[PDB]
Amino acid sequence: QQGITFSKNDVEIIARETLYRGFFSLDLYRFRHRLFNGGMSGEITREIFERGHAAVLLPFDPVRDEVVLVEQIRIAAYDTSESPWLLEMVAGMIEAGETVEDVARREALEEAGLEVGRTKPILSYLASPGGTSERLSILVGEVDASTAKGIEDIRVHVVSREQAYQWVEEGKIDNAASVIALQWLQLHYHNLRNEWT
Amino acid sequence: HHHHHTFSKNDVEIIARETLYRGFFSLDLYRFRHRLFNGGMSGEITREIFERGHAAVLLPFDPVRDEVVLVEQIRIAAYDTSESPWLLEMVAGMIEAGETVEDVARREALEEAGLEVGRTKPILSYLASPGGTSERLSILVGEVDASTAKGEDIRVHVVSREQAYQWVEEGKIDNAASVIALQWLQLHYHNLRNEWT
Ligand SMILES: Nc1ncnc2c1ncn2[C@H]1C[C@H](O)[C@@H](COP(=O)(O)OP(=O)(O)OP(=O)(O)O)O1
Ligand SMILES: Nc1ncnc2c1ncn2[C@H]1C[C@H](O)[C@@H](COP(=O)(O)OP(=O)(O)OP(=O)(O)O)O1
Ligand SMILES: [Mg+2]
């Protein structure tokens, strides 16, 4: 098919308002936008959770076919999970003037003690665009997993790719960044092992 | 150092949840203490958490025709970081008190895209961004006859599975729910088509 129809020019962001400002923000967008039928929308307002944007790193060891995961508590998981301690990808906020790659390498070093070799982009996704602006940009990074060493109270895990992917299937890994990265790895590891060796 | 293939909820003390903002959505300050990997308990920690409820997601897959049904609508929170705020997405809706994932998914497929659903199977249930929001989304794949789709301003698209996945690879589909669902389909479609035929 022919994909989406409209672009930014087809929407008028009339104004924004910050309804809550703390560590994060809750903003109200007021806007009008074009309709598929032709006309123009009424004035629309939407609450948006604003927390900046993140870089994510999947540490992959192509010699060993192993991944490095970081475990730490995420209290927001409490209400819908058996435990709020989650197995996750390395990640951090992108500050002004920083690149996805700069941040991913830095966080790999200070959350997992990992020196990263080559990187490659995986995917950049919107976490939940009905209610938050957050975008997370994922890279895969070449590591030697035998060197992983842990520490914000963080435990470092080394597991085989196949076990990590089985834990996605089983629900033991169930946060978006880690699901997306590990599904991508399951689709791309043959070529990635070919390339990095 | 690391762990090579822990805590439960008795190891966390939620002291308070302090309302920060109440509107359409909510922002709460969680105040809590938790067990530390090296022994003892943390001091009191506070985290701002976006509370917006939880969602059911349906990937409508026609296994006879190897086609997927996508829905297009504007999501203004995509504006700042995306080429366009109109997104191609899976069918989805909030789960209200007492409702099941399957009931919500089937209802939204009918109202959002005109589809009756035959068999379903679970894909995965994931936390969208658990550092800052409690939101969980539970994805099903639903058997549909893609030649019955039709159709808040929404436009329905019927595309080959291979095209929908190519759009994930190219960044033209880049919201978490649709990426996770279509990566899962690319890993499972051969067995799924055989099971449903
Ligand atoms: N991120 C969001 N996604 C979806 N709905 C949202 C979001 N933030 C706020 N809302 C709700 C709050 C309001 O009920 C509704 C606003 O819709 P809109 O078309 O702008 O005005 P309205 O006059 O229909 O609304 P109201 O129901 O408050 O009278 O959207
Ligand atoms: N959801 C969140 N994720 C990550 N950091 C968060 C989140 N919400 C708030 N923060 C940040 C903001 C503050 O730096 C800190 C929250 O307050 P808190 O844990 O009490 O530390 P603090 O810097 O205010 O010091 P003190 O312990 O002396 O009160 O964490
Ligand atoms: Mg960090």
TrEMBL record, chain A:
- Catalyzed reaction equations: ADP-D-ribose + H2O = D-ribose 5-phosphate + AMP + 2 H(+)
**Binding of Mg(2+) 2, residues:** E107, E111
Q: Which GO terms describe its cellular component?
A: cytosol
Named from the GO MF annotations, one term is:
ADP-sugar diphosphatase activity
Which top EC class is given?
A: hydrolase
Where is the motif Nudix box annotated in this sequence? 92-114
Q: Which Pfam families match?
A: NUDIX (PF00293)
Task: Give EC number(s), comma-separated.
Answer: 3.6.1.13
Listed A to Z, the keywords are: Hydrolase, Magnesium, Metal-binding, Nucleotide-binding
Q: What InterPro entries does this protein map onto?
A: NDP_pyrophosphatase, NUDIX_hydrolase-like_dom_sf, NUDIX_hydrolase_CS, NUDIX_hydrolase_dom
Q: Which SUPFAM superfamilies match?
A: Nudix
- UniProt binding sites for AMP: E47, R74, G130
One annotated GO biological process: nucleoside phosphate metabolic process
Can you state the subunit structure given in the record? Homodimer.
Tell me, in a sentence or two, what this protein's role is. Answer: Acts on ADP-mannose and ADP-glucose as well as ADP-ribose. Prevents glycogen biosynthesis. The reaction catalyzed by this enzyme is a limiting step of the gluconeogenic process.
Family indicated by similarity? Belongs to the Nudix hydrolase family. NudF subfamily.
Q: What is this protein called?
A: ADP-ribose pyrophosphatase
Name the source organism: Klebsiella pneumoniae subsp. pneumoniae (strain HS11286)
